Amino acid sequence: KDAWEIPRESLRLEVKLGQGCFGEVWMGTWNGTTRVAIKTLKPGTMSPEAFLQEAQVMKKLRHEKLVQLYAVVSEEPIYIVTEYMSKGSLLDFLKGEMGKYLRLPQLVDMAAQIASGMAYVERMNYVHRDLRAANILVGENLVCKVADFPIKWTAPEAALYGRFTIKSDVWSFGILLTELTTKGRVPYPGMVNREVLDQVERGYRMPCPPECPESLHDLMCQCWRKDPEERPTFEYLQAFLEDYFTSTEPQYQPGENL
Numbered sequence: 001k002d003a004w005e006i007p008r009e010s011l012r013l014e015v016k017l018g019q020g021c022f023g024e025v026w027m028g029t030w031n032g033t034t035r036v037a038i039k040t041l042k043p044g045t046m047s048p049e050a051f052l053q054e055a056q057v058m059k060k061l062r063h064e065k066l067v068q069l070y071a072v073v074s075e076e077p078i079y080i081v082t083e084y085m086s087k088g089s090l091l092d093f094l095k096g097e098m099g100k101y102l103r104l105p106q107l108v109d110m111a112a113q114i115a116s117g118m119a120y121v122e123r124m125n126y127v128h129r130d131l132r133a134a135n136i137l138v139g140e141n142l143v144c145k146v147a148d149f150p151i152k153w154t155a156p157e158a159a160l161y162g163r164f165t166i167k168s169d170v171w172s173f174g175i176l177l178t179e180l181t182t183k184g185r186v187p188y189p190g191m192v193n194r195e196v197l198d199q200v201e202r203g204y205r206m207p208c209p210p211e212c213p214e215s216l217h218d219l220m221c222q223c224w225r226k227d228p229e230e231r232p233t234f235e236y237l238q239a240f241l242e243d244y245f246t247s248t249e250p251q252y253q254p255g256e257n258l
């Protein structure tokens with residue numbers, strides 16, 4: 001019971017946000033002042049240790065582009081409280097309305113910010129294991145942050161031999177690049193998990209998404225190298241994206257969709 005622990009009182013659980021197997025996500029007010037997301041755990045559905053492992057994880061990881069843990073209610077009902085992100089998941093946001101007006105530059109910025117949060121995660125020798133647009137939260141100002149709550153996003157060695165490493169996160173990140181540039185569409189359209197596993201192993205990689213720049217597709221392809229160690233770092237990725245429109249696609253012109 002630590003200095004992240006708080007009273008449920010400082011927490012106003014205003015709006016529910018998600019329905020899970022082990023709890024619900026609420027949008028609430030912390031100290032009646034600061035807007036916060038609140039991941040509840042339904043006691044009797046999952047041990048506190050288990051549910052608060054993610055919280056313990058979030059503690060050691062303070063970064064501008066990661067969902068910041070804000071406080072915790074360990075003693076049941078077990079609330080985890082975090083900075084709130086107005087726009088919800090990057091997935092709901094890509095598929096959704098404001099998605100339609102997102103082009104490469106905003107998409108690549110997001111990529112960049114995630115790449116960054118993920119780079120932070122990298123420095124920390126942490127792994128995400130579920131890096132995918134559904135786990136990126138968008139904030140105001142297209143702030144996106146890595147959050148957490150799927151073999152299409154999962155690097156083979158991770159999907160197959162459970163070799164989940166930041167590198168397999170890079171892989172996912174590659175998938176997230178397609179989410180980002182397909183406006184949230186499901187990776188490997190028309191293919192189902194087994195067709196994907198079968199495929200990705202035979203060496204299949206998604207083609208260049210409609211109107212996405214080959215250089216962004218190459219980035220993706222790097223992210224999906226069979227050999228995990230060949231996959232780039234998120235320091236490379238971040239930087240590659242941050243600088244994308246100068247070092248990589250200076251001649252970029254907005255398009256219909258990207």
Ligand SMILES: CCN1CCN(Cc2ccc(NC(=O)c3cccc(-c4ccc5nc(NC(=O)C6CC6)sc5n4)c3)cc2C(F)(F)F)CC1
Binds near residue numbers: 017038061
């Ligand atoms: C070993 C596998 N590894 C280890 C390390 N590894 C890092 C990690 C682990 C866990 C988490 N846990 C969360 O992130 C979290 C939890 C609860 C709530 C929220 C949360 C935050 C804001 C927010 N805004 C919202 N608005 C909307 O919905 C509106 C439009 C409709 S709903 C919402 N929910 C976020 C974050 C991170 C990580 F960040 F990656 F480092 C993940 C798993």
